[PDB]
Amino acid sequence: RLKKRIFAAVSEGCVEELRELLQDLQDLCRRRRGLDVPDFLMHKLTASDTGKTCLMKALLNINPNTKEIVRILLAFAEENDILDRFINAEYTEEAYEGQTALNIAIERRQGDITAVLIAAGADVNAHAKGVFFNPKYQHEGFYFGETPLALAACTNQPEIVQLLMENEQTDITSQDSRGNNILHALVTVAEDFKTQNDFVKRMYDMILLRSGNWELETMRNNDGLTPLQLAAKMGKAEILKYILSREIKEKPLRSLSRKFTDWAYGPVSSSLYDLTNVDTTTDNSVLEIIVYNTNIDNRHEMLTLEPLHTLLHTKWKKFAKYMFFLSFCFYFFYNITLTLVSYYRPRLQLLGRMFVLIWATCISVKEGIAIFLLRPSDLQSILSDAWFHFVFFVQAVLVILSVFLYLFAYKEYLACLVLAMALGWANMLYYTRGFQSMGMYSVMIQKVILHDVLKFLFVYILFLLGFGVALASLIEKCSKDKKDCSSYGSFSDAVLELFKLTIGLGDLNIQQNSTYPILFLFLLITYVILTFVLLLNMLIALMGETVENVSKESERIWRLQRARTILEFEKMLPEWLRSRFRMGELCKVADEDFRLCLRINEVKWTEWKTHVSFLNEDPGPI
Amino acid sequence: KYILSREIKEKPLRSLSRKFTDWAYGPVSSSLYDLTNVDTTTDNSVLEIIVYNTNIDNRHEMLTLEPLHTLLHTKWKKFAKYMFFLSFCFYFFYNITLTLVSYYRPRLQLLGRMFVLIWATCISVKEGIAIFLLRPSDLQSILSDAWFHFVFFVQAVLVILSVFLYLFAYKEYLACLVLAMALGWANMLYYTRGFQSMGMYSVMIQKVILHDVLKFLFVYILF
Amino acid sequence: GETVENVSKESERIWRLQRARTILEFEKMLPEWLRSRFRMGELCKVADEDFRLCLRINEVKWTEWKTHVSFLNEDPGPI
Numbered sequence: 001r002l003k004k005r006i007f008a009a010v011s012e013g014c015v016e017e018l019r020e021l022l023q024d025l026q027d028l029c030r031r032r033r034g035l036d037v038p039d040f041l042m043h044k045l046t047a048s049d050t051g052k053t054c055l056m057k058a059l060l061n062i063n064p065n066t067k068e069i070v071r072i073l074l075a076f077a078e079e080n081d082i083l084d085r086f087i088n089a090e091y092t093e094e095a096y097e098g099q100t101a102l103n104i105a106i107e108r109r110q111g112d113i114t115a116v117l118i119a120a121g122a123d124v125n126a127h128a129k130g131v132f133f134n135p136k137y138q139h140e141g142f143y144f145g146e147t148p149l150a151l152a153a154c155t156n157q158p159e160i161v162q163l164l165m166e167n168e169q170t171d172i173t174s175q176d177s178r179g180n181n182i183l184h185a186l187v188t189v190a191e192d193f194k195t196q197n198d199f200v201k202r203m204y205d206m207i208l209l210r211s212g213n214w215e216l217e218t219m220r221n222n223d224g225l226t227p228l229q230l231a232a233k234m235g236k237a238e239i240l241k242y243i244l245s246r247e248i249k250e251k252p253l254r255s256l257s258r259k260f261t262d263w264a265y266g267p268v269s270s271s272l273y274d275l276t277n278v279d280t281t282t283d284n285s286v287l288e289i290i291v292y293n294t295n296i297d298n299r300h301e302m303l304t305l306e307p308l309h310t311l312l313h314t315k316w317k318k319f320a321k322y323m324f325f326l327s328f329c330f331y332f333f334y335n336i337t338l339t340l341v342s343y344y345r346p347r348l349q350l351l352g353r354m355f356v357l358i359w360a361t362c363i364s365v366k367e368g369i370a371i372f373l374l375r376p377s378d379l380q381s382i383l384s385d386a387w388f389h390f391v392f393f394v395q396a397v398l399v400i401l402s403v404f405l406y407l408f409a410y411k412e413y414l415a416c417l418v419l420a421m422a423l424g425w426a427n428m429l430y431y432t433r434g435f436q437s438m439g440m441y442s443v444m445i446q447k448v449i450l451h452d453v454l455k456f457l458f459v460y461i462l463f464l465l466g467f468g469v470a471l472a473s474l475i476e477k478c479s480k481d482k483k484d485c486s487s488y489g490s491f492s493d494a495v496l497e498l499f500k501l502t503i504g505l506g507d508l509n510i511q512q513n514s515t516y517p518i519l520f521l522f523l524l525i526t527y528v529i530l531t532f533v534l535l536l537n538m539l540i541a542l543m544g545e546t547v548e549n550v551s552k553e554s555e556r557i558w559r560l561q562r563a564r565t566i567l568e569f570e571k572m573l574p575e576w577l578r579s580r581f582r583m584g585e586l587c588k589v590a591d592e593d594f595r596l597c598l599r600i601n602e603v604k605w606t607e608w609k610t611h612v613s614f615l616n617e618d619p620g621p622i
Numbered sequence: 623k624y625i626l627s628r629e630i631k632e633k634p635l636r637s638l639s640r641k642f643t644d645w646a647y648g649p650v651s652s653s654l655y656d657l658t659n660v661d662t663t664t665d666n667s668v669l670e671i672i673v674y675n676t677n678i679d680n681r682h683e684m685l686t687l688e689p690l691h692t693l694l695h696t697k698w699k700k701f702a703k704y705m706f707f708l709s710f711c712f713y714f715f716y717n718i719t720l721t722l723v724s725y726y727r728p729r730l731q732l733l734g735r736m737f738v739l740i741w742a743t744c745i746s747v748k749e750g751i752a753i754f755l756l757r758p759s760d761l762q763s764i765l766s767d768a769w770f771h772f773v774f775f776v777q778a779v780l781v782i783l784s785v786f787l788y789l790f791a792y793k794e795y796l797a798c799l800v801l802a803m804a805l806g807w808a809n810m811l812y813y814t815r816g817f818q819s820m821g822m823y824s825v826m827i828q829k830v831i832l833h834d835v836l837k838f839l840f841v842y843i844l845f
Numbered sequence: 846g847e848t849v850e851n852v853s854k855e856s857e858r859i860w861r862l863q864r865a866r867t868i869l870e871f872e873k874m875l876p877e878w879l880r881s882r883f884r885m886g887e888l889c890k891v892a893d894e895d896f897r898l899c900l901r902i903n904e905v906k907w908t909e910w911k912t913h914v915s916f917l918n919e920d921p922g923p924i
């Protein structure tokens with residue numbers, strides 16, 4: 001019953017009252033035998049229900065006289081000899097299991113009381129496991145990293161980070177319950193420049209350089225993700241751009257950079273980019289992760305970074321350009337051979353029928369595998385990346401069951417064959433990816449069909465069928481001979497007549513066997529006003545707005561899907577021919593370091609600095 | 623905007639604020655907004671006043687303030703989404719039943735005729751009340767907020783007097799029935815409000831018809 | 846085309862306004878027992894003696910970085 005008065009007094013901030021209550025409590029220690037005076041006292045200062053001690057309650061409430069309160073409480077704990085048992089207490093409920101007083105001092109931005117808590121012997125490995133510090137959804141939880149160094153780095157306070165770093169007791173590479181060390185946590189909380197500043201990038205290089213090794217940046221997450229592949233798997237374009245081209249111009253720490261300058265005579269400079277884990281030589285590279293990431297929208301703005309851009313171009317210069325053209329020739333000849341053995345039906349050099357069957361089996365099997373790997377169960381993905389997978393599969397299986405209907409059951413085998421023919425030529429539209437002009441034209445067809453043509457077809461079909469049934473139900477009996485001026489006779493006949501007025505074909509004839517010629521003209525002219533005037537011209541206007549919006553960012557979407565075909569061609573040719581085409585070369589980067597880097601030359605006429613850190617004193621290619 | 627989210631961070635005057643912060647650990651923070659007189663629990667709340675204010679043009683820029691935005695979304699998550707879809711199904715089936723007992727005229731399971739009559743009476747009465755409360759005497763208001771009230775009323779009363787002409791006087795009862803059929807399908811265009819894409823497409827049809835198609839029809843009819 | 850370009854900046858707001866009109870018209874149509882079933886907020890101890898029945902909105906701000914006083918609950922999280 002005394003502890004409640006202690007907690008109140010320490011929350012309000014009354015210094016003298018605290019002194020008197022602690023004195024009364026020490027007298028309670030005297031005037032009693034008990035079992036263990038420091039233990040019983042620790043039980044008095046602790047709120048057993050939550051584990052919250054008097055010190056943590058002193059720090060949750062900022063109480064402008066709170067520094068004295070911490071000093072008095074630490075002095076009392078020193079009198080009764082329980083300083084470690086006191087200052088290293090945690091919570092004990094599922095919500096905040098692990099939070100210690102150092103954690104509360106670091107996130108309250110108390111740069112003073114935290115030094116007093118460290119010097120008094122805190123635990124710089126807190127590991128606030130909890131379920132609020134490790135949540136399920138985004139809100140109602142933080143996930144700073146489960147460590148006082150991770151919290152001090154994720155709340156943007158470098159002074160406390162420096163205080164934690166230059167300590168012999170801190171464990172800089174302690175992975176938490178997710179597998180994340182400090183650097184996975186920093187690339188987890190990172191956002192863009194407009195939401196937060198660039199403080200996470202600055203704290204990233206601060207922690208990296210101040211430790212100094214590759215050990216911290218090759219640790220494996222619990223998902224097998226280096227802190228680089230994590231930045232690529234969740235689409236942190238800013239901290240990823242920083243990592244991929246990171247140069248340290250200091251002699252002792254030159255080794256842990258990813259971009260070295262070779263010669264740089266005047267303005268001209270040839271800088272080579274480390275390519276170790278950003279090329280598809282191993283499992284889960286950064287190209288494969290960025291290209292095959294059907295879970296983010298930051299892709300086409302992450303393929304423009306320096307190593308990945310020159311990497312994908314070198315691939316569409318060595319082998320991918322020719323495998324693409326070769327695939328186009330094979331599909332073109334398969335389509336022609338399909339449309340000549342189907343248009344020249346009856347009523348040597350006719351092996352084309354079994355050729356079509358062979359390549360239909362090939363395409364069907366291959367595309368079925370691709371669909372099983374793409375996993376299109378997630379919504380919108382089928383229209384997102386695997387539309388042409390699905391379409392190539394449909395057309396190939398259509399040719400299949402048109403052969404397993406022609407001979408096996410002898411039925412109507414023309415519906416499948418003719419559908420397969422028309423679908424084949426639409427797939428040639430797929431093969432426009434190879435050209436920039438003709439290939440980012442085919443990426444506004446997709447945006448325009450989705451946004452504008454679908455909404456127009458919905459409203460137009462409503463009017464077509466509404467006025468079709470109204471006009472049709474206005475016409476009396478067929479005729480005196482069952483067939484005369486019955487253009488708008490039945491439903492489907494009136495719907496066809498209205499469709500032909502929209503296309504502009506035929507001849508408008510209003511002299512119908514109608515009971516009301518005026519009402520007929522009113523409904524028919526209203527239909528003309530609603531579609532020929534409003535809906536079709538409004539389609540052109542909205543389609544102009546869509547083209548204007550998606551013309552700023554259509555080259556990037558095109559380059560992204562061209563990159564998907566490049567990557568799919570790469571993992572298709574054998575390892576001897578694969579080894580024939582490699583991107584970079586082994587270069588002596590440090591005392592003993594071979595990195596197999598790319599090489600990119602550039603010209604800069606603005607900085608004009610004296611050149612040190614060159615990798616080669618004599619310039620030029622030799 | 624200032625009043626609805628007004629926080630006083632001082633201990634003696636903390637009481638007269640309308641937005642309190644609960645926990646706010648690091649960056650994350652859970653602030654709760656006082657909702658006393660901005661929710662439609664009483665008479666003349668702030669939602670009812672802002673939404674039913676056919677006298678100002680600042681409305682759609684006042685519904686984006688913090689309590690009112692999350693308030694209207696919570697309503698179109700608990701009950702309004704399903705009452706809307708349910709109303710759309712009832713009107714769709716009333717239209718089909720109207721267009722099958724009118725296209726399959728002569729020369730069990732035909733209670734559809736009295737169903738149409740019943741729901742025509744319902745819609746006519748209800749929409750007539752809504753028009754008397756909307757008070758469309760002020761200019762441009764009928765095109766502003768009660769266009770679909772007027773159109774639903776016209777179509778329902780058309781079906782009415784096409785029944786009170788078919789049997790009571792035995793006259794030309796097809797002009798009313800057929801006009802009512804075509805008007806019914808235009809009212810389905812009303813029911814596009816439920817979706818963002820398809821529903822703010824139907825709000826450029828309104829702006830385009832008013833500004834561009836009317837002026838064009840005037841000059842074109844002259845020529 | 847000129848009209849579409851002008852009213853495309855402010856068409857989501859007009860739409861949300863008329864969707865709000867149907868929401869409000871559906872509200873004042875269902876009975877008070879079913880109405881009481883759906884309430885937006887909850888009674889929360891705001892002051893010494895003040896129940897306000899407030900909403901609740903979470904947010905994330907990475908710029909201000911101030912020491913936190915005036916919190917309504919010292920221990921964080923939903924509990």
Ligand SMILES: CCCCCCCC/C=C/CCCCCCCC(=O)O[C@@H](COC(=O)CCCCCCCCCCCCCCC)COP(=O)([O-])OCC[N+](C)(C)C
Nearest residue numbers: 457460461464491492493495496497499500502503531536
């Ligand atoms: C600006 C405009 C834009 C276009 C707007 C188009 C709007 C649509 C316009 C359509 C109107 C066209 C005329 C329809 C009626 C014709 C008569 C007829 O055949 O009736 C038959 C049905 O016929 C059909 O069902 C038609 C064919 C299928 C529907 C049309 C394609 C669907 C859209 C595809 C979209 C694919 C998209 C791409 C997908 C990858 C029934 O006849 P019956 O009663 O059995 O006859 C009995 C007596 N007899 C047997 C002696 C005969």
Ligand SMILES: CCCCCCCCCCCC(=O)OC[C@H](COP(=O)(O)OCC[N+](C)(C)C)OC(=O)CCCCCCCCCCC
Nearest residue numbers: 461462464465466469490491492493495718721722725807
């Ligand atoms: C999504 C698809 C878009 C494309 C259009 C497809 C359909 C085209 C027409 C096919 C007609 C057909 O074939 O049958 C239509 C059938 C029977 O027709 P029938 O009266 O016997 O006339 C046959 C005449 N012959 C023999 C000369 C061919 O129903 C009807 O008459 C019922 C009409 C009223 C109900 C439908 C109203 C719809 C309103 C709008 C809802 C959104």
